[PDB]
Amino acid sequence: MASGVAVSDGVIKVFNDMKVRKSSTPEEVKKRKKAVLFCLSEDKKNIILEEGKEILVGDVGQTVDDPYATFVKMLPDKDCRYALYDATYETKESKKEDLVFIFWAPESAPLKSKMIYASSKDAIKKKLTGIKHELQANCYEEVKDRCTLAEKLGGSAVISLEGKPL
């Protein structure tokens, strides 16, 4: 077995909402996932998503002050996983959102949950179909760096990455 990994479909199901967003009123658009932290199944060969690991956007104003912090927070270097963060920044003109597949691949992760992901980075995109943007890091600094997510929107005119951090 070369490509030891098989998405559970739902990965696309939970992502289908990220690509299309799926909003309407102010009581919904706010409840948008700002970092769907996925993860490998138990068999260690089935790309799936998590249930208790998915940050939103409205949280920034609800109870949370900085979602980007929640990400790396539950993004240890020993837990190689996937993620799709939304570049909800505020440039000198208006706010924008660039879906960036935050590829959490900590080189120091467990080989028993890393050899797959690394060799699965392509299996995942097999369904994503060359996702628009993305960001893969192997360090808390690289993942917990505001400038990092500001490297695919236009820092040249970004007065804020979250209306505060920048």
From Swiss-Prot:
Transmembrane segments: none
Domain of life: Eukaryota
UniProt keyword list: Acetylation, Actin-binding, Cell membrane, Cell projection, Cytoplasm, Cytoskeleton, Host-virus interaction, Isopeptide bond, Membrane, Nucleus, Phosphoprotein, Ubl conjugation
Modified residues (Phosphothreonine): T25, T63
Location of the motif Nuclear localization signal: 30-34
PTMs per UniProt: Inactivated by phosphorylation on Ser-3. Phosphorylated on Ser-3 in resting cells. Dephosphorylated by PDXP/chronophin; this restores its activity in promoting actin filament depolymerization. The phosphorylation of Ser-24 may prevent recognition of the nuclear localization signal. Phosphorylated via a ARRB1-RAC1-LIMK1-PAK1 cascade upon active ligand stimulation of atypical chemokine receptor ACKR2.
Residue list for modification N-acetylalanine: A2
GO cellular component: actin cytoskeleton; cell-cell junction; cofilin-actin rod; cortical actin cytoskeleton; cytoplasm; cytosol; dendritic spine; extracellular exosome
GO biological process: actin cytoskeleton organization; actin filament depolymerization; actin filament fragmentation; actin filament severing; cell projection organization; cellular response to epidermal growth factor stimulus; cellular response to ether; cellular response to hydrogen peroxide
Location of Phosphotyrosine modifications: Y68, Y82, Y140
PTM annotation (Phosphoserine): residues: S3, S8, S41, S108, S156
Description of what induces expression: Up-regulated in response to enterovirus 71 (EV71) infection (at protein level).
A Pfam entry, by short name: Cofilin_ADF
Residues where N6-acetyllysine is found: K13, K73, K144
Places the protein is found: Nucleus matrix; Cytoplasm, Cytoskeleton; Cell projection, Ruffle membrane; Cell projection, Lamellipodium membrane
SMART domains: ADF (SM00102)
Family named by the database record: Belongs to the actin-binding proteins ADF family.
Described purpose of this protein according to its UniProt entry: Binds to F-actin and exhibits pH-sensitive F-actin depolymerizing activity. In conjunction with the subcortical maternal complex (SCMC), plays an essential role for zygotes to progress beyond the first embryonic cell divisions via regulation of actin dynamics. Required for the centralization of the mitotic spindle and symmetric division of zygotes. Plays a role in the regulation of cell morphology and cytoskeletal organization in epithelial cells.
UniProt name for this protein: Cofilin-1
